Design a protein around this ligand. Structure first.
Ligand SMILES: *[C@@H]1O[C@H](CO)[C@@H](O)[C@H](O)[C@H]1NC(C)=O
Ligand SMILES: *[C@@H]1O[C@H](CO)[C@@H](O)[C@H](O)[C@H]1NC(C)=O
Lengths: 108, 50
């Protein structure tokens, strides 16, 4: 898993947000995009930003035109599903994206 | 008149706080689907102060 897309129509006549994770970099972008019918990662611009054995956890929420990201990392044993235990996610970013959101999709 | 400056006079629903929306689809003002053409109850949602 290496990115996400969020929006109302997700492409075409409305704005949407893209996130991509790129080995050492991260890229975040907003546009009236026209992505693929079946998106991929491997071998306009009205906002832009740049920077089993493990479980990565995230929360995405949109409030007052800001988009808030929280995250956590942990090692794990359980192969089947989310492990019984406890840790709390901590804030990464609070982005002034302004768009409306209704749908999302994972990139992998 | 200067027409570089525009305001939206019609929308489907009110903005959420700090919501931004640049979309330019034809506003359907009534019963009939507009399919991206102007007409009776089918309007461009932007206007200018001029
Ligand atoms: C992806 O990361 C590589 C390695 O840092 C970098 O060369 C490349 O420019 C990044 N992609 C973008 C869109 O900048
Ligand atoms: C946000 O987008 C959805 C899907 O198009 C729409 O139903 C809703 O009315 C929009 N919300 C606002 C506050 O405009």
């Amino acid at each position: 898993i290496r990115g996400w897309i969020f929006g109302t129509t997700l492409d075409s006549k409305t704005q949407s947000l893209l996130i991509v994770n790129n080995a050492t970099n991260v890229v975040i972008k907003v546009c009236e995009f026209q992505f693929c019918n079946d998106p991929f990662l491997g071998v306009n611009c009205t906002f832009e930003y740049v920077s089993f054995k493990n479980l990565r956890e995230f929360v995405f929420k949109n409030i007052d035109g800001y988009f808030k990201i929280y995250s956590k990392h942990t090692p794990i044993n359980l192969v089947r599903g989310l492990p019984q235990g406890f840790s709390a996610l901590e804030p990464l970013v609070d982005l002034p994206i302004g768009i409306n959101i209704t749908r999302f999709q994972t990139l992998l | 008149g200067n027409y570089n400056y525009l305001y939206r006079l019609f929308r489907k629903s009110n903005l959420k706080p700090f919501e931004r929306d640049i979309s330019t689809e034809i506003y359907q003002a009534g019963s009939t689907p507009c399919n991206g053409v102007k007409g009776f109850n089918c309007y461009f949602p932007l206007q200018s102060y001029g």
